[PDB]
A paper describes a structure:
In addition to transcripts encoding an FP clearly homologous to A. victoria green fluorescent protein (avGFP), as we expected, the A. cf. australis transcriptome also contains several transcripts encoding other, much more divergent avGFP homologs. Characterization of the recombinant proteins revealed that these avGFP homologs include a green-emitting FP that appears to be the brightest FP discovered to date, 2 long-wavelength-absorbing CPs, and a reversibly photochromic FP. We have identified several new Aequorea FPs with the potential to further diversify the landscape of fluorescent probes and biosensors.
We were surprised to discover a second green-emitting FP in A. cf. australis, AausFP1, that shares only 53% amino acid identity with avGFP. These already extraordinary properties are further bolstered by a low fluorescence pKa (4.4), unusually narrow excitation and emission peaks, and higher photostability than mEGFP (see below). Despite low expression in its native context, wild-type AausFP1 expresses and folds very efficiently in E. coli at 37°C without any modifications. X-ray crystallography revealed a uniquely stabilized chromophore environment in AausFP1 that may be responsible for its unique properties. AausFP1 photobleaches at similar rates to mEGFP on both widefield and confocal microscopy when instrument settings are identical, but because AausFP1 emits photons at a higher rate (due to its high quantum yield and extinction coefficient), its true photostability is somewhat higher than that of mEGFP (S1 Text and Figs Z and AA in S1 Text).
Residue numbers in the entry:
A (entry chain B), B (entry chain A): 7 to 64, 68 to 232
């Protein structure tokens, strides 16, 4: 199912303090390498929040997994899985997100909704004061047998224009869309690395993305 | 002054919901390997909270640093540095801690105070329902030039007796005790690995620790 590089499609609807927007993305994921390359367009005009703020919201199934850690997202495929997050920004509001990640017609689809509230008028998010770049991160993956899934935790470091960084605290739940058996792993990490870029020839508000996700058995590797 | 294995001494005073306690530790740290081995005794009787809950509170200077990342804690030595943390436990209270980490008489000293409040009667902390073990973790180290130091973020995964895990969210600030020059690094990670043990011959409430800390230039290493 993930033996080859395969197409990745994203359909996102957002609403942040009443500002509605749509994002569409197309790219590929290669679970052999853990690499994602995708292009995102805001199809409703100007994105009303920083691109970096929605990077995590816009495919964990593409992560490079070794044989000796259960791969919950790939196990939930092809019927797929629900990915829910609360993202709380330092001194600012929260994104609540609900995604359905499915395998259809040789492609992975990430169809995701986002609501934002509690954001400050001239803060880093509504003021769009975050740099257009990204930092590498460590994703925590924990078993959640009670929910037939995994709970994940991430701190995201956002670089602020003119110096400084803020944290976006991520709480994440992945549960199955199917009725099939799922593989629920022991606690481990996913190393994340992300380069954001623009196409100079692209006139629409956009974000291009090159990502690497590698699962690490930290109980062994950090010893 | 970190070229050799050197002694490590810890003096901790705690107050959680009015329960006062003292912890003393002795061991060594080796910054060549990133290894800490130390023994902790509660000198006031029974520890009123889980040992694992105070593991992070009871020497980042011992972490194994490569040449290409600035080592803030070693740079602050020998006058040393202040380590402040807010630790907020899932569905439970918060530890506020202030440490002074110094080099005196051939030894690293961690003299640290802890206050706990907002804890639930019969919860995982006051009920001591956390397992006597520890998980590996990823420490985020960020520059904080405004404070002549570093800000660090950690999620700690605590295993609960009889199954389950909770998160202890760590916010950490390190500032100098001296007026000397300090080395403030770019954003990077410290991989942490910790094994807890008891001495069968020890009659006092106690915790022995073997730890490995390695700084990783994640901007490069995760690519």
């Amino acid at each position: 199912l993930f033996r080859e590089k395969i197409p990745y499609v994203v359909e996102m609807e957002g609403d942040v303090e009443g500002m509605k927007f749509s994002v569409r993305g197309k790219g590929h994921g290669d679970a052999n390498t853990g690499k994602i390359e995708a292009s995102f367009i805001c199809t409703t005009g100007e994105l009303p929040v920083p691109w970096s703020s929605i990077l995590t919201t816009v495919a964990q199934c593409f992560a490079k997994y070794p044989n000796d850690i259960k791969d919950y997202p790939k196990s939930a495929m092809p019927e797929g899985y629900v990915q829910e997050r609360t993202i709380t920004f330092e001194n600012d509001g929260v994104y609540k997100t609900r995604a359905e990640v499915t395998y259809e017609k040789g492609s992975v689809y990430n169809r995701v909704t986002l609501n934002g509230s509690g954001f400050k008028k001239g803060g880093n998010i509504l003021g769009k004061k975050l740099e257009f770049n990204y930092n590498p991160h460590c994703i925590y993956v924990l078993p959640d047998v009670q929910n037939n899934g995994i709970k994940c935790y991430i701190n995201i470091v956002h670089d602020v224009i003119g110096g400084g960084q803020i944290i976006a605290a991520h709480q994440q739940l992945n549960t199955p869309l199917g009725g099939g058996p799922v593989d629920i792993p022991h606690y481990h990490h996913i190393q994340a690395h992300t380069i954001l870029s623009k196409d100079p020839k692209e006139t629409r508000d956009h974000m291009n993305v090159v990502e690497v996700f590698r699962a690490i058995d930290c109980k062994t590797a950090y010893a």
